[PDB]
Amino acid sequence: MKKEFSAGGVLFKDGEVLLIKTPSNVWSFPKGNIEPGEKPEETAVREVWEETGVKGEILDYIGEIHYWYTLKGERIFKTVKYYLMKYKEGEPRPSWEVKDAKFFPIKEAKKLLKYKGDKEIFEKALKLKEKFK
Amino acid sequence: MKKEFSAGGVLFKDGEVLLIKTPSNVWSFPKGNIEPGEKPEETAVREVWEETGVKGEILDYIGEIHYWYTLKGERIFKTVKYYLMKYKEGEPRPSWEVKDAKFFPIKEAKKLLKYKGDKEIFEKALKLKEKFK
Amino acid sequence: MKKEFSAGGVLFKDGEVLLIKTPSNVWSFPKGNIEPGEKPEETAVREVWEETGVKGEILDYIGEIHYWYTLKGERIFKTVKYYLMKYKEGEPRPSWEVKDAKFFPIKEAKKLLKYKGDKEIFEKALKLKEKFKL
């Protein structure tokens, strides 16, 4: 078994948040694995851009969710740190690793989320979004 | 005899104290192993910096706590020296190591702390803190 | 609960195995925490080098062991992956963290090992090294 380190973001663009659809047909947030020597904030920005083609700015740390899963017979413990981001540039274009990447009005996003983990993160994110905007 | 000597910091910013959330979900103070050739004070400043992204200045030496634990059938002796710090700059951001990093009002901090050692150290820190202001 | 992931190495040179003498006087294998963004193989080669001054080359994955312990009343899970290595260069020189670093004939090393995990891993290592004629 091994541990996996990932970081991603809840990026907002004028009342809308960036979401992606996983191979399992679940809408969640853009995230990705750490690169050698990166701090989580660095990983978060890079992976969001690579997965959605959208470049964002980190405003604050929201939280972390974790879970076990298997890949090729080995148990993997994954931890994902999430950061509140604000739109910079680019357009949503899902990489081959996600079924889709699209902006959704906050109202629309709330319902799409499945995993209680993502919903908790989004909730926290919205609250933090206030103090900043 | 295995001996693990660490150093940590109890940093304050306008009536608030800096705490980190450990993998056990318990809120505590940033601390880490004192590397060979490193003064405990340097270890404390570095660990606070690395785990929270907050830079602090040491005001005084609070105290030290001792405890043992068993690993692979062997007794290990551990001690942690704590230093009182005052905020200098930086914004609370957790490392891949911790779940969170946040400032808490003293009243609330006393509530979050769990380890008897953290409580004893915090109480000593509050008294030593008056010396300054 | 907190989970710790480490990696270590079982390195052979001219038919002998490299062991380190821990603070408790127990001879064991070098190992260390797998840093974020680090492959377990990188961790093993690095730890062997830092603890013994010996540079090794990964031959293959041996296996992993795990165990639990309590710290400050909290349960902690720890697992360690081990890799088979062949000597590349360097002389045994212990780090500040260990008492000694030395090569031992397999027969002697088997008697020196104490930790259950080390014994299990060494057994697997001995069966695996046959392929590389070490």
Place this chain on the structure above:
Amino acid sequence: MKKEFSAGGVLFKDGEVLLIKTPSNVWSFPKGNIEPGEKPEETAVREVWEETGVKGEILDYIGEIHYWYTLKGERIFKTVKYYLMKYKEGEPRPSWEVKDAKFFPIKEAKKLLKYKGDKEIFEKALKLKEKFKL
């Protein structure tokens, strides 16, 4: 409570060993405290040079001596690692920390050393010295 790390050497020149005289008037081996980032072998070379003005080359690790003592109202667990060294450059001169620095024939050195640890380290060093043209 704190840990202290030092390293030094049993350095030979033309069959003689380099000794220093401590403030307590005892002949012993040159050694000193680790600096930030140093491996023990690095500390040993630098400290022997600073303490005696003699540059030595490390040939092997001898062993270590450890003990608890009190410094400025605090218990310190000190570990001193020793290395067999070959003379390379310099003339012995005591630093401000020692009373003298001088080379002595092995037979005389054996008689001069007083601390049990020093005697044991010297015994080990002489055995290791046999493997080199030192």
